[PDB]
Design a protein around this motif. Structure first.
Motif, PDB file in Angstrom:
ATOM      1  N   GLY A   1       0.807  -1.242   0.000  1.00 37.42           N
ATOM      2  CA  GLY A   1       0.000   0.000   0.000  1.00 37.42           C
ATOM      3  C   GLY A   1       0.828   1.274   0.000  1.00 37.42           C
ATOM      4  N   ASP A   2       2.026   1.213   0.610  1.00 37.77           N
ATOM      5  CA  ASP A   2       2.738   2.476   0.690  1.00 37.77           C
ATOM      6  C   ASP A   2       4.187   2.333   0.215  1.00 37.77           C
ATOM      7  OD1 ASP A   2       3.951   1.179   2.854  1.00 37.77           O
ATOM      8  OD2 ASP A   2       2.940   2.410   4.390  1.00 37.77           O
ATOM      9  N   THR A   3       4.532   1.255  -0.488  1.00 36.52           N
ATOM     10  CA  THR A   3       5.873   1.127  -1.105  1.00 36.52           C
ATOM     11  C   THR A   3       5.702   0.645  -2.556  1.00 36.52           C
ATOM     12  OG1 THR A   3       6.205  -1.125  -0.239  1.00 36.52           O
ATOM     13  CG2 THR A   3       7.121   0.628   1.024  1.00 36.52           C
TER      14      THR A   3
ATOM     15  N   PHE B   1      10.509   3.056  -3.249  1.00 43.86           N
ATOM     16  CA  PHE B   1      10.077   4.303  -2.657  1.00 43.86           C
ATOM     17  C   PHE B   1       9.040   4.027  -1.573  1.00 43.86           C
ATOM     18  CE2 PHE B   1      11.561   8.105  -4.924  1.00 43.86           C
ATOM     19  CZ  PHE B   1      12.239   7.504  -5.958  1.00 43.86           C
ATOM     20  N   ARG B   2       9.143   4.751  -0.438  1.00 38.53           N
ATOM     21  CA  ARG B   2       8.138   4.703   0.625  1.00 38.53           C
ATOM     22  C   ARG B   2       7.410   6.036   0.586  1.00 38.53           C
ATOM     23  NH1 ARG B   2       4.946   5.188   4.258  1.00 38.53           N
ATOM     24  NH2 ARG B   2       4.859   4.040   6.269  1.00 38.53           N
ATOM     25  N   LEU B   3       6.081   5.991   0.571  1.00 39.00           N
ATOM     26  CA  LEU B   3       5.305   7.237   0.357  1.00 39.00           C
ATOM     27  C   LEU B   3       5.407   8.081   1.638  1.00 39.00           C
ATOM     28  CD1 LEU B   3       1.979   5.909  -1.271  1.00 39.00           C
ATOM     29  CD2 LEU B   3       4.118   6.812  -2.278  1.00 39.00           C
TER      30      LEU B   3
ATOM     31  N   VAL C   1       2.320   8.834   5.197  1.00 37.69           N
ATOM     32  CA  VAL C   1       1.212   7.923   5.327  1.00 37.69           C
ATOM     33  C   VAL C   1       1.650   6.561   5.902  1.00 37.69           C
ATOM     34  CG1 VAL C   1       0.096   8.975   3.256  1.00 37.69           C
ATOM     35  CG2 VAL C   1       1.386   6.905   2.973  1.00 37.69           C
ATOM     36  N   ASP C   2       0.657   5.834   6.391  1.00 34.01           N
ATOM     37  CA  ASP C   2       0.893   4.458   6.824  1.00 34.01           C
ATOM     38  C   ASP C   2      -0.276   3.612   6.393  1.00 34.01           C
ATOM     39  OD1 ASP C   2       2.381   2.442   8.061  1.00 34.01           O
ATOM     40  OD2 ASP C   2       1.441   2.726  10.002  1.00 34.01           O
ATOM     41  N   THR C   3       0.011   2.660   5.519  1.00 38.42           N
ATOM     42  CA  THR C   3      -0.995   1.664   5.173  1.00 38.42           C
ATOM     43  C   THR C   3      -0.816   0.456   6.087  1.00 38.42           C
ATOM     44  OG1 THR C   3       0.488   0.836   3.349  1.00 38.42           O
ATOM     45  CG2 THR C   3      -1.303   2.380   2.685  1.00 38.42           C
ATOM     46  N   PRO C   4      -1.877  -0.351   6.292  1.00 36.85           N
ATOM     47  CA  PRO C   4      -1.737  -1.628   7.060  1.00 36.85           C
ATOM     48  C   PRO C   4      -0.840  -2.575   6.287  1.00 36.85           C
ATOM     49  CG  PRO C   4      -4.092  -1.069   6.690  1.00 36.85           C
ATOM     50  CD  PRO C   4      -3.271  -0.102   5.848  1.00 36.85           C
ATOM     51  N   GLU C   5      -0.031  -3.359   6.998  1.00 37.63           N
ATOM     52  CA  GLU C   5       0.808  -4.357   6.330  1.00 37.63           C
ATOM     53  C   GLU C   5      -0.142  -5.343   5.636  1.00 37.63           C
ATOM     54  OE1 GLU C   5       4.174  -4.103   6.142  1.00 37.63           O
ATOM     55  OE2 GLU C   5       4.088  -2.222   7.293  1.00 37.63           O
ATOM     56  N   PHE C   6       0.329  -6.011   4.567  1.00 34.98           N
ATOM     57  CA  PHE C   6      -0.512  -6.909   3.763  1.00 34.98           C
ATOM     58  C   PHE C   6      -1.233  -7.957   4.626  1.00 34.98           C
ATOM     59  CE2 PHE C   6      -1.495 -10.736   1.539  1.00 34.98           C
ATOM     60  CZ  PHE C   6      -2.257 -10.257   0.474  1.00 34.98           C
TER      61      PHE C   6
END
Ligand SMILES: Cc1cn([C@H]2C[C@H](OP(=O)(O)O)[C@@H](COP(=O)(O)O)O2)c(=O)[nH]c1=O
Ligand SMILES: [Ca+2]
Length: 129
Positions: free
Chosen positions: A14-16, A28-30, A33-38
């Motif tokens: 979600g965020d890489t 790249f890491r956005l 923000v923090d998305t939940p891990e898969f």
């Protein structure tokens, strides 16, 4: 801030994302923000959302902030745009990421993203349901 060209190498989560930037592969890491891990709740949805966004883009751009451009893992830190739309903001507006990791000096789009999070929470979207 300035937008610079990159091309997709592969969706990660979600965020890489792995992009080719100035001719070199890099993860790249956005920013902001923090998305939940898969493996977590909404993790799969966040990964799917970013994947669709980056794979469907005809033009991908990265925009560094004023501060550190790489993290301690060697990941690029950037805002990412897909055909002119910022992925970072789009994930937050959809309740698929929380605003997070706001470090002094890399926080140009903080208030834009908080505004998106408020609307997502208002609507009880996804993480906020
Ligand atoms: C988004 C971001 C993450 N990071 C680091 C902090 C966290 O360190 P720790 O790994 O020690 O917790 C990690 C969070 O990234 P992930 O959410 O991808 O795990 O990445 C930065 O240093 N700067 C940033 O701007
Ligand atoms: Ca994460």
């Amino acid at each position: 801030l300035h937008k610079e060209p990159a091309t997709l190498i592969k969706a990660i989560d979600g965020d890489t994302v792995k992009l080719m930037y100035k001719g070199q592969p890099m993860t790249f890491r956005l920013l902001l923000v923090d998305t939940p891990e898969f493996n977590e709740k909404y993790g799969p949805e966040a990964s799917a959302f970013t994947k669709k966004m980056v794979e469907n883009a005809k033009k991908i751009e990265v925009e560094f902030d004023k501060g550190q451009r790489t993290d301690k893992y060697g990941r690029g830190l950037a805002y990412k745009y897909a055909d002119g739309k910022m992925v970072n903001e789009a994930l937050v507006r959809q309740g698929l990421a929380k605003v997070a990791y706001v470090y002094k000096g890399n926080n140009t789009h903080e208030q834009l993203l908080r505004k998106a999070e408020a609307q997502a929470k208002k609507e009880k979207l996804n993480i906020w349901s």
